[PDB]
Design a protein around this ligand. Structure first.
Ligand SMILES: CCc1c(-c2csc(N3CCN(CC4CCN(CC)CC4)CC3)n2)[nH]c(C)c1C(C)=O
Length: 102
């Protein structure tokens, strides 16, 4: 039951218009400084893989990874940058969709 909702949230985040920065892991060879700054990278396809394996024991673990995506986003990108702007839309989407399930 706790896993069923995450399947919905993740499917909705995957297809959201503002999801394009977060569908695959950041390629640190292409982003000067990323590895130095972001110690725990996270993205939607990693969460999708972990969910497929069943590696989420609880609903809160899924939420921790989701928040980590947007913490990393706000750590590295300016709020007015094109990736920052998308991260805020996705972050607000996740929080508001999380709260109508829990
Ligand atoms: C600033 C760099 C950064 C990004 C970023 C910048 S551009 C981009 N991608 C990701 C993948 N995407 C795949 C294509 C190919 C397939 N499709 C074609 C139909 C369209 C999309 C291409 C654009 N990701 N994301 C994050 C979290 C960042 C940081 C530093 O936090």
């Amino acid at each position: 039951s706790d896993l069923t909702f995450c399947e919905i949230i993740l499917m909705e985040m995957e297809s959201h218009d503002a999801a394009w920065p977060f569908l695959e892991p950041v390629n640190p060879r292409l982003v000067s400084g990323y590895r130095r700054i972001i110690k725990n990278p996270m993205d939607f396809s990693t969460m999708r893989h972990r969910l497929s394996r069943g590696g989420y024991t609880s609903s809160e673990e899924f939420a921790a990874d989701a928040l980590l995506v947007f913490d990393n986003c706000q750590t590295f990108n300016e709020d007015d940058s094109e990736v920052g702007k998308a991260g805020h839309i996705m972050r607000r989407f996740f929080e508001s969709r999380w709260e109508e399930f829990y």
